[PDB]
Amino acid sequence: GDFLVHHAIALGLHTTTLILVKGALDARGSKLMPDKKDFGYSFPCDGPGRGGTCDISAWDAFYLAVFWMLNTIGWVTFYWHWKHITLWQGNVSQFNESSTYLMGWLRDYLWLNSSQLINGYNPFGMNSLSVWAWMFLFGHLVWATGFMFLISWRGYWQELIETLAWAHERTPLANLIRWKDKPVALSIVQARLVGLAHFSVGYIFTYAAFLIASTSGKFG
């Protein structure tokens, strides 16, 4: 199992390095955009011509590499935590036998060790683990929220916003109040950053709550 997880870690490291190096070396231009250095480090695109140029800047290359770094660190921390939990409980054989297949991971690490976490508050009462369960759900919410910015793009939202201005301007007793800055949807680059921030915050909070609660419920 250590062999398999070490090779998975190596795969993650190699893929992240590949993404970052490809982003760094093609920063001054390529065959698709020979004059990329004249447009700066961060810019949305070069239009839909020549087949489409979505995420053509080095900033998007960095933006795509954060997911892989998070995945690799998650694998490393999962391995460390499961191995040390099995060592501390005095049942090291469970990790030796159950770590060679992925269903073993899903059943004997996540499902098994999350019983005390999800019982922080129940229809019968609460105990000191309530805050960790609340943070678990909060992290799930933020991580899911990031998907809205990551999947849906700008043109849908500007059209929706354009109608709300009309609704406000045509409503009695409310058109007496007017804005100073014209509302617009978030820019192309901004939404990627917002989605990435939501993703990372949810990831960190959820794993921290699970790890801390699962260790402290058993070993204090």
Binding site: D26, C45, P48, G51, G52, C54, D55, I188
Partner: protein
């Protein structure tokens, strides 16, 4: 309607989807086949299957309505007054639908977060529940009471009520199992029904906004010239990503998936907790989950714990038995669903630039094909992402449902 094939297709698809949903709702409460009510797996499978089919057909209706709007609309020779009047006040319709969606989302999902916070803080007496603050569905209970008293008063020719779920009080047991019995309605049903309404309203908003603004808008006056399926109109005007009518269907498929998943989860938990069970010689009913739906479904933590965590032990422990195929499909669908996020979160330029390096080494060894490799288009990438997402999610739910219901 006698010259355009797309409008007829849209109308027929909408009607067929609605009929499929009606059939799915009617089949479970009025079992038409012998020994079908006591076969729980068959009932669950048929319900979920027909609901998914109806949802897909409903989405296709809006898609083809948008196609007709883009292509076959011609006021010069095919003028219609009703269609003209609708297009002249679309802003009010969209704004009102937006307000309704926001209000429903605030006043339906917000009550769940309130219950979670009060439960976490240690104040069970300040929650929206049957014991602290009741939100009773008094209108539906009145309908149940009226239908339970229908025979002999308003239906003299009938001997019994149409369904046993109206609340007659009689229970039918076949082979030691409970076939059907009255279904109570409480505070949780109120919340879940309003959640259903919120999700349906959001999906309708997305699809109708896509259909109505298919030809033009204040942002792109000439949107009809670009066609029904185009990716964008450049980075100008701040950004014009996904302005076509195709992108609105692409976006509404996700919401259809969300709504149908919530509905099927509600059905499964409610039937397992309040209807299905076993009867003994003395006539005491023991349900599958012990009737915990009333007090546990009022919080998100309850849904995560008593439904997702508790009922998934059947599929994760199916290895080494005849049900291991469902256990394999669980992880396979997990992988397929997770694999779709690569196409949805990324763009074409990176993959086109990466291919250039791969082609270079093939040229070095004289293995470069004459059919030049090109990265997928934007529309193709979005379609692949949505297809893999839907397939993974539906396969996961299918495997979980079958593995849970076959064993117990």
């Amino acid at each position: 309607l006698t010259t355009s094939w797309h409008a007829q297709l849209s109308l027929n698809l909408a009607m067929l989807g609605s009929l499929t949903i009606i059939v799915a709702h009617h089949m479970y409460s009025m079992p038409p086949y012998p020994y079908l009510a006591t076969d729980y797996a068959t009932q669950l499978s048929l319900f979920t299957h027909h609901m998914w089919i109806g949802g897909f057909l409903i989405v296709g209706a809006a898609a083809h309505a948008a196609i007709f709007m883009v292509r076959d609309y011609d006021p010069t020779n095919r003028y219609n007054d009703l269609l003209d009047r609708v297009l002249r006040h679309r802003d009010a319709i969209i704004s009102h639908l937006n307000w309704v969606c926001i209000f429903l989302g605030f006043h339906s999902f917000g009550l769940y977060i309130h219950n979670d916070t009060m439960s976490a803080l240690g104040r069970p007496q300040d929650m929206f529940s049957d014991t602290a603050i009741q939100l009773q569905p008094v209108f539906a209970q009145w309908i149940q009471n009226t239908h339970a008293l229908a025979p002999g008063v308003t239906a003299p020719g009938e001997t019994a009520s149409t369904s046993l779920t109206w609340g007659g009080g009689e229970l039918v047991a076949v082979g030691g199992k409970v076939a059907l019995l009255p279904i109570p309605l409480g505070t949780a049903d109120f919340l879940v029904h309003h959640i259903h309404a919120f999700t349906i309203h959001v999906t309708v908003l997305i699809l109708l906004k896509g259909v109505l603004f298919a030809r033009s808008s204040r942002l792109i006056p000439d949107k009809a010239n670009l066609g029904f399926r185009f990716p964008c109109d450049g980075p100008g005007r701040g950004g014009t990503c996904q302005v076509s009518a195709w992108d609105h269907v692409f976006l509404g498929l996700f919401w259809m998936y969300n709504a149908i998943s919530v509905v099927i989860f509600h059905f499964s938990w409610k039937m397992q907790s309040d209807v299905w069970g076993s009867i003994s010689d003395q006539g005491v009913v023991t349900h599958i989950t012990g009737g915990n739906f009333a007090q546990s479904s009022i919080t998100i933590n309850g849904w995560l714990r008593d439904f997702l965590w508790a009922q998934a032990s059947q599929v994760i422990q199916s290895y080494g038995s005849s049900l291991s195929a469902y256990g394999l499909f669980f992880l396979g669908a997990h992988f397929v669903w997770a694999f779709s996020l690569m196409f949805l979160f990324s763009g074409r330029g990176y993959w086109q630039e990466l291919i250039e390096s791969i082609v270079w080494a093939h040229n070095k060894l004289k293995v470069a094909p004459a059919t030049q490799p090109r990265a997928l288009s934007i529309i193709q990438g979005r379609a692949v992402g949505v297809t893999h997402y839907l397939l993974g999610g539906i396969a996961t739910t299918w495997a979980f449902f079958l593995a849970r219901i076959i064993a117990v």
